[PDB]
Nucleic acid binder design. Structure first.
Lengths: 253, 351, 254, 253
DNA sequence: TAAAAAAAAAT
DNA sequence: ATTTTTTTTTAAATATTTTTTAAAAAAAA
DNA sequence: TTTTTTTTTAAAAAATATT
């Protein structure tokens, strides 16, 4: 296993996003790329992390090995890398240690980091065939702002899909809080563009603690691809440009 | 037990007591009286006044307290030599007569107070009725053998053995609440070496060499000064306390110059006042040889100690397992070297 | 009798921000040749050798030798009452129980006199032999602070090895292992980035990391750490204070 | 009630000023303007807020309501607002709801925040108007710097006014602060604009912890107006630019 | 084995 | 009025845990 | 680059079990 990554800040932001919600995760390393369907420390939210081999520089893998690592210790090791450090993963065939080489951008400061591993394995749950009813491609800084706003009111956000826009209704001890979005006139690609598709009406109640954990993937991708239906869990998707996606699943309340 | 010695060094030489925390000792071998810790953990560790009665009928309070004291004392890198108490000489028989009549007064007052129902005074006067036994020290030395910390048995007194262990250079210091170690001969004495200690009552590192330099006297005259303070071996002159003994020692060096220039109608010399034998017992006590003994901090057996404390001392499995894991990670790493080994002091700086 | 006008007193603020995390009480060895502070840690592991020479002070007129026992967290709380442009003027009176610190702003509108209290201290001054070191490594200070801050997450002790290719900051702990290698470079256009290693023999030593993280608070002074090593001589972590002298941090190995 | 601010950063800075010492406040609005005369939980200092109706972009009030607003929660609702939102306060004359509508001027996010308001019949303590001795006008960043300077010294500042300038001074167990400013008569209009309005030598003792909560109002104005005399409480006036003012009252020690 | 505090001749 | 000593009495942890004061460190203005 | 802020750990509080 040798997975070189020139944009190692992508992997650092993945570990910053996943350090507060999953403590111990299995890393289903396939030949197609880095894959993860781990689940949180509670029994509420599912995380489907996919890092394909196209965005990696040189990806080599021989067998479908699953590494149960500690995501807090791995995030503390990913904090040792810089924001422009080239990160080369390395796993031995027999030794259960994950070697991380944070090469410098000028290739001066070579930073070899060997990580101990545990042996925690969990059952695998895949994508249960979502119809993708309401797909809200909206900016991730705005979704982080919306969840950080409505976490200060209560633990219940009410999201309603419509043609003219999307609502974010929250109520609690402080009072009523609604946040309404709209479309965008000019065709802009990533930022300031809330694009919503519409098949059937939906109105669901979500927790703000797990959504506040979900909004820590804001520096990964600029666009949150929300996806939900009636009695279908909310898919907060974090499609990275060079490889894969980070899917956050949340059952309604 | 020298009355008014630590207060004398505190109000005369605050520079000699290098006051510091438990963080300030890395790899320093410290020879500790066991019996002081055993009484501290039979008195302070209480079940409401029941001294941790286990399910078999023994007393597991002191093993609990000094076990966790020893685990947190390897967490700070201090290497303990738990020197156990010895058979006391004939000079301490009067002090044990005083302790026996104090225990008799405490027993009579405990039997008076248990009828009255004042349960706090009952707890106080059963805390004043703590007696060391052969089985307490035997099971405590068994615990030292099980957890890998070396121990010594004194022939006469533990303070003399600790002071000659510092005097031979085998250990760095003595950790006694007793102040006798400055007169049995230890140049460096720490006090209040406890485990749970951040800022509440930190370590008073007394220095015998510093106080002998700043008051300007040798070891024999300091021994005589602590005779006139009043030790637990022979009595003192009535009417002479800290400051009068300091002034008469600094004006009159030998004990004969203390004795013969004193009128009996104002400062009497007491009857059977054996200053010479207490002087010889502070200079040359019955001490086991510190060069002959060996101090080795062996690796403890983990699960055997766990089944010992959970089979007949009634502890928790995870608690003793966490303690042996804490000492095992304490002994795993390399020792932290000091800076005064590599650099030599030229001179101090004033204010 | 002692007056020290320092126009660039931002680096004096950086000195006392570096000092407060390591030692709390110290004595300034103030002489007419300059201002010195050779004070040792309370755990007796690490020494701070300070030198502010009289050439860097723009008005230095101190007559005789003065030793001033000072609480350095209190002195740093006094020096946190000045910005990054003020002319910090050290002033001491006759039989100086107070240190007058005048923080004159350079636009001459705000003059902040801080006469701050002292204490009586009897601190020892160790004897440092002036002897050459085996591995003299001259790295950037921000990169060294980065290295110590990353390796403090894994374990409490780096195991630093000098070698032919360069210095290696190996460290291990309960999170696994970490090795940071630094090749000697000379092709960069900046002289601050050029990691210069003066090799005599390859030497491997183990140093604690709480003290190294205490040492790397001096990194706002200049971007030059002169790591100096030998077989069992303590590590010198030397910071060039700008045109006064050094902040030589000493550290006994393991 | 319908009050609209074209720049709601003034209202957000007012609530971040007033959330630290006033916990519960009464917003005695009127047709003439928005007013507040509430006094803190320590019952030692009076806060006078004047928000004129000319500074509001769209103001409308006819009943002259007397609502009582929980001030930390409504500062959290202003923390939900952005720094450039067109904030529309609203209150119906039959219900006890304080509606807040935050509208970005370019971005399409319109967010509505209702509130529950408790009943507050708290009496007013109207200060008299009198000529003050030292009506020193100094920069707000300078006063925040001086209060954060002398707050490390102790909990007491003596403030002396003379011909040369204002002289702040603090004494404590750590040392003795003495911050002496100067009268500035410059024409170039730099960052320092310390003007003296010198009438009579005064020297008064004020608490510095309290004054740290007082100078939490720093980004409202570039300059403050410490108007004070020998026995009356210190008046710290935060002249908002053509919008109103925030007067702060502190009794001397 | 320690100390504080108060009573009481020494000061 | 101290100065000094000697009588009574009062005492002698530890850890885990939760809940707090204080000091930082990113992540933005 | 430095602010202030917001947040997250590393010291004391403060009893309770420790048994």
């Amino acid at each position: 296993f040798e997975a070189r990554l020139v944009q190692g800040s992508i992997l650092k932001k993945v570990l910053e996003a996943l350090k507060d919600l999953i403590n111990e995760a299995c890393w289903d390393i396939s030949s197609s790329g880095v894959n993860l369907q781990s689940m949180d420390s509670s029994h509420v939210s599912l995380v489907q992390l996919t890092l394909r081999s196209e965005g990696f520089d040189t990806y080599r893998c021989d067998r479908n090995l699953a590494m149960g690592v500690n995501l807090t210790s791995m995030s503390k090791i990913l904090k040792c890398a810089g924001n422009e450090d080239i990160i080369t993963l390395r796993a031995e065939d027999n030794a259960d240690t994950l070697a991380l080489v944070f090469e410098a951008p000028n290739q001066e400061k070579v930073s070899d980091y060997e990580m101990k591993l545990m042996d925690l394995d969990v059952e695998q749950l895949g994508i249960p065939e979502q119809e993708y009813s309401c797909v809200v491609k909206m900016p991730s800084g705005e979704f982080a702002r919306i969840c950080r706003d409505l976490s200060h009111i209560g633990d219940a956000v009410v999201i309603s899909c419509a043609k003219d826009g999307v609502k974010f209704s929250a109520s609690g001890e402080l009072g009523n809080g609604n946040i309404k979005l709209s479309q965008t006139s000019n065709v802009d690609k990533e930022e300031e563009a809330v694009t919503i598709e519409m098949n059937e009406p939906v109105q669901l109640t979500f927790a703000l603690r797990y959504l506040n954990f979900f909004t820590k993937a804001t520096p990964l991708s600029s666009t949150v691809t929300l996806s939900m239906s009636a009695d279908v869990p909310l898919v907060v998707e974090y499609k990275i440009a060079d490889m894969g996606h980070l899917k956050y699943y949340l059952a309604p309340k | 037990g020298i009355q008014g010695l630590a207060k004398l060094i505190a109000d005369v030489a605050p520079s000699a007591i290098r006051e510091n925390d438990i963080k300030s000792y890395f790899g320093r071998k410290v020879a500790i009286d066991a019996s002081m810790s055993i009484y501290q953990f039979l008195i302070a560790v209480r079940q409401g006044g029941d001294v941790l009665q286990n399910e078999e009928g023994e007393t597991t309070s002191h093993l609990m307290g000094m076990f966790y004291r020893t685990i947190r004392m390897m967490e700070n890198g201090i290497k303990p030599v738990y020197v156990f108490d010895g058979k006391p000489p004939q000079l301490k028989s009067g002090e044990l007569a005083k302790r026996s009549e104090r225990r008799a007064e405490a027993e009579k007052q405990l039997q008076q107070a248990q009828a009255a129902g004042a349960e706090q005074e009952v707890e106080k006067f059963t805390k004043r009725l703590v007696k060391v036994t052969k089985q307490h020290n035997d099971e405590c030395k068994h615990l030292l053998s099980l957890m890998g910390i070396p121990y010594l048995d004194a022939p006469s007194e533990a303070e003399a053995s600790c002071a000659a262990l510092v005097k031979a250079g085998k250990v760095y210091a003595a950790a006694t609440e007793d102040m006798d170690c400055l007169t049995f001969g230890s140049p460096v004495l720490m006090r209040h070496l406890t485990a749970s200690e951040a800022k509440k009552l930190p370590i008073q590192e007394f220095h015998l060499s510093r106080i002998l330099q700043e008051l300007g006297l040798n070891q024999e005259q300091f021994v005589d000064l602590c005779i006139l303070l009043g030790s637990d071996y022979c009595e003192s002159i009535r009417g002479i306390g800290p400051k009068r003994a300091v002034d008469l020692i600094q004006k009159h060096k030998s004990i004969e110059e203390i004795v013969r220039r004193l009128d009996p109608n104002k400062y009497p010399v007491p009857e059977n006042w054996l200053h010479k034998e207490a002087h010889q017992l502070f200079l040359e006590p019955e001490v086991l040889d510190p060069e002959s003994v060996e101090l080795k901090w062996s690796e403890p057996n983990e699960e055997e100690l766990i089944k010992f404390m959970c089979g007949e001392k009634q502890f928790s499995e995870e608690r003793i397992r966490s303690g042996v894991k804490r000492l095992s990670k304490s002994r795993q790493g390399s020792t932290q070297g000091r800076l005064d080994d590599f650099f030599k002091v030229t001179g101090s700086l004033s204010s």
